[PDB]
Amino acid sequence: IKTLSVSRPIIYGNTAKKMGSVKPPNAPAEHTHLWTIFVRGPQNEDISYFIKKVVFKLHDTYPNPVRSIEAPPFELTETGWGEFDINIKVYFVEEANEKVLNFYHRLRLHPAEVSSVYFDEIVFNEPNEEFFKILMSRPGNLLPSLERPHRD
Numbered sequence: 001i002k003t004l005s006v007s008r009p010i011i012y013g014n015t016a017k018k019m020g021s022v023k024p025p026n027a028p029a030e031h032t033h034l035w036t037i038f039v040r041g042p043q044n045e046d047i048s049y050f051i052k053k054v055v056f057k058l059h060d061t062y063p064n065p066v067r068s069i070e071a072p073p074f075e076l077t078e079t080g081w082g083e084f085d086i087n088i089k090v091y092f093v094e095e096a097n098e099k100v101l102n103f104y105h106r107l108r109l110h111p112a113e114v115s116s117v118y119f120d121e122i123v124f125n126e127p128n129e130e131f132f133k134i135l136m137s138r139p140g141n142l143l144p145s146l147e148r149p150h151r152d
Helices: 129-137
Strands: 006-018 033-040 051-057 066-069 074-080 085-092 101-106 114-124
Touching: 006 085, 006 101, 006 129, 033 051, 033 085, 051 074, 066 074, 085 114, 101 114
Parallel strands: none
Antiparallel strands: 006 033, 006 114, 033 074, 051 066, 051 085, 085 101
């Protein structure tokens, strides 16, 4: 028990909706849809305990197409009229001892919200010991961490 591997499940992809009269004051003309590109946990658990930042690379026609999200939720909303590939770069907390992980997602606008989401698992083959303390102390634990006396 020198090295201990561990995985974390994630969901990545986008949702999209047709845009009506309700839109931001500076919504580019001819943009027909809004969309949210994201990296999430199952049950929308906050995944910032292992993810440090997510960097989304949009199409080069977008202003400042490299969008770095450095606090949760790891998502951004944009508008547009068409589909293209987005490069999602996931960076990990130091204790994970894991380099950047790349995903590529094709934005989906059709077919009334649409959802194009992919389930994957990030593996950490050589995390620091401290990584497991971070993981196990994340909110929501119900179990005892000591021998808790109890009646029959």
